[PDB]
Amino acid sequence: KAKELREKSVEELNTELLNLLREQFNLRMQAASGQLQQSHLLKQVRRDVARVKTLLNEKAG
């Protein structure tokens, strides 16, 4: 999953990061409200934010 992130540019890595954070917020709000049975999305999105800003850190020098 990190590969296709690698060929992506810093500019679009930020857009994806924002998209992931909005998804994290949405999933948090479903999960708190009682729906969202697919409870693993939470871990998936945290992990995806992690790799996105790992890549985004290593691009910056």
């Binding site: 924002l18 954070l21 909005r22 994290q24 917020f25 948090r28 709000m29 708190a32 409200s33």
Partner: peptide
């Protein structure tokens, strides 16, 4: 900025 807003709301009481 956008990130902090995405972080401040936990759940509806």
């Amino acid at each position: 900025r956008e990130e902090r807003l995405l972080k401040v709301l936990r759940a509806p009481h």
